[PDB]
């Protein structure tokens, strides 16, 4: 009934590294998706209490959102770029799982995903 705590975003027990792919994911991918007209429902964890969706966290057990991804990138939480790409994919699929196909929120997620895929097809080498 209450919201769960947000996903973990910082872990000092994991080694950290800076790569051109991780820099691209924050400076280009996250920054461009954040400013998209349909980004607003995906910038923070789904607040099931404020939105009156009592079954959201009964259905969605692996929540993910762009605010959490931004924090993970800033905190060097990811070692590999694919970990970050899987978080974006988890965010889109959570929307497709919870909501009815053809719903406006699903159309918004589909548009963000299309832009995300355009950015991932241009990921820099190594
Ligand atoms: C202040 O922003 C909002 O009011 C808000 C509305 C909103 C969602 C998220 C937010 C952000 S939050 C921090 O409150 O969780 C939202 C997000 N996601 C990912 C979902 O799967 C949803 N299913 C139904 C809603 C959402 C309600 N709804 C929504 N429903 C239909 C839409 F077309 C667009 C939407 F944003």
Swiss-Prot record:
Compartments reported by the entry: Nucleus; Chromosome
User: Which residue positions hold the site described Acetylated histone binding?
Assistant: 99
Ranges for the Bromo domain? 17-123
Q: Where is this cross-link: Glycyl lysine isopeptide (Lys-Gly) (interchain with G-Cter in SUMO2)?
A: 58
Tissues where the protein occurs: Ubiquitously expressed.
Task: Give the domain of life.
Answer: Eukaryota
PTM per Swiss-Prot/TrEMBL: Phosphorylation by CK2 disrupt the intramolecular binding between the bromo domain 2 and the NPS region and promotes binding between the NPS and the BID regions, leading to activate the protein and promote binding to acetylated histones. In absence of phosphorylation, BRD4 does not localize to p53/TP53 target gene promoters, phosphorylation promoting recruitment to p53/TP53 target promoters.
Explain what the record says happens when changing residue 104 to G. Found in a patient with a neurodevelopmental syndrome; uncertain significance
What is said about its interaction partners and assembly? Interacts with p53/TP53; the interaction is direct. Interacts (via CTD region) with CDK9 and CCNT1, acting as an associated component of P-TEFb complex. Interacts with RELA (when acetylated at 'Lys-310'). Interacts (via NET domain) with NSD3, CHD4, BICRA and ATAD5. The interaction with BICRA bridges BRD4 to the GBAF complex. Interacts (via NET domain) with JMJD6 (via JmjC and N-terminal domains); the interaction is stronger in presence of ssRNA and recruits JMJD6 on distal enhancers. Interacts with NSD3. Interacts with NIPBL.
Similarity-based family? Belongs to the BET family.
Q: Show the domain comment.
A: The NET domain mediates interaction with a number of chromatin proteins involved in transcription regulation (NSD3, JMJD6, CHD4, GLTSCR1 and ATAD5).
Linked disorder reads:
Cornelia de Lange syndrome 6: A form of Cornelia de Lange syndrome, a clinically heterogeneous developmental disorder associated with malformations affecting multiple systems. It is characterized by facial dysmorphisms, abnormal hands and feet, growth delay, cognitive retardation, hirsutism, gastroesophageal dysfunction and cardiac, ophthalmologic and genitourinary anomalies. CDLS6 inheritance is autosomal dominant.
Q: Briefly state the protein's biological role.
A: Chromatin reader protein that recognizes and binds acetylated histones and plays a key role in transmission of epigenetic memory across cell divisions and transcription regulation. Remains associated with acetylated chromatin throughout the entire cell cycle and provides epigenetic memory for postmitotic G1 gene transcription by preserving acetylated chromatin status and maintaining high-order chromatin structure. During interphase, plays a key role in regulating the transcription of signal-inducible genes by associating with the P-TEFb complex and recruiting it to promoters.
In Swiss-Prot or TrEMBL terms, this protein is called: Bromodomain-containing protein 4
Q: What is the lineage of its organism?
A: Eukaryota, Metazoa, Chordata, Craniata, Vertebrata
Q: Which residues of the full protein are shown?
A: 44 to 167 of 1362
């Amino acid at each position: 009934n209450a919201n769960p705590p947000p996903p973990e975003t910082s872990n000092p027990n994991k080694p950290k590294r800076q790569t051109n792919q991780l820099q691209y994911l924050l400076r280009v991918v996250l920054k461009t998706l954040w400013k998209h007209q349909f980004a607003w429902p995906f910038q923070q964890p789904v607040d099931a209490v404020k939105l009156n969706l009592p079954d959201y966290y009964k259905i969605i057990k692996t929540p993910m959102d762009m605010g959490t991804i931004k924090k993970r990138l800033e905190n060097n939480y990811y070692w590999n770029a694919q970990e970050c790409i899987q978080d974006f994919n988890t965010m889109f699929t959570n929307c497709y799982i919870y909501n009815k196909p053809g719903d406006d929120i699903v159309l918004m997620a589909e548009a963000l995903e299309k832009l995300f895929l355009q950015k991932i097809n241009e990921l820099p080498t190594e």
